Amino acid sequence: KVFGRCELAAAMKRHGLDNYRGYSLGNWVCAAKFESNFNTQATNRNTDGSTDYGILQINSRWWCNDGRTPGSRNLCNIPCSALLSSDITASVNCAKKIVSDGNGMNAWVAWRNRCKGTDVQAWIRGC
Ligand SMILES: [Cl-]
């Protein structure tokens, strides 16, 4: 599915992302916009043989297992296929692990380049 902006903000808040590990909700909504354009089924292949999966573009080298990535570590202990559900539970639960690993939201390239440093609370305004 393709979420609306406020629709995803409300779902992300129900799943505990607002202020999680120091990151207000607007960070997570901005990240999803620029990572996946709010589509739970987005996928993107990378030069190292990994693929990024779902609404938050979670990577198959470090975080989820897709069975075809060399050097897999599966640190979220989840098949990547579950991250293409229209229900965001599995993606959120893995995102919480990623953002707790010691480098904040810098795991999300689109967030680092296109959200960080902007007024991210604009992404929840009006919701
Ligand atoms: Cl998979």
Tell me the technique behind this structure. Answer: X-ray
Q: Is the dihedral of CA 67, 77, 45, 86 positive or negative?
A: positive
Determine the distance separating the centroid of ligand 1 and the alpha carbon of 64, expressed in angstroms. Answer: 8
Our answer to whether residue 18 is catalytic in this structure is: no
HSE at residue 47, side-chain half, CA atoms within 13 A, is: 0
At how many Å resolution was this determined? 1.2
Written as one letter, the residue type at 18 is: D
Spatial separation of the C-alpha atoms in residues 69 and 79, rounded to whole Å: 12
In CATH, what number is assigned to the domain containing residue 44? 1.10.530.10
How many structural domains is the chain composed of? 1
Domain range enclosing 15:
1-127
The single residue of 7, 18, 48, 52 carrying the catalytic annotation is 52
DSSP character for 86?
Answer: S
CA–centroid distance, residue 38 to ligand 1 (Å): 20
Q: Which of 18, 35, 48, 119 does the annotation list as catalytic?
A: 35
Question: Where does the chain have alpha helices with state H?
Answer: 5-14, 25-36, 89-99, 109-114
CA separation for the pair 59, 79 (Å, rounded):
11
Q: In this structure, are residues 56 and 91 in contact, taking their beta carbons and an 8 Å threshold?
A: yes
Which residues partner with 2 through β-bridges?
39
Residue 52 annotated to the active site: yes
Measured CA to CA, the distance from residue 107 to residue 47 in angstroms comes to: 17
- The neighbourhood of ligand 1, an ion, using CB within 5 A, equals 66, 79-81
> Can you say which residues are annotated as belonging to the binding site for substrate?
101
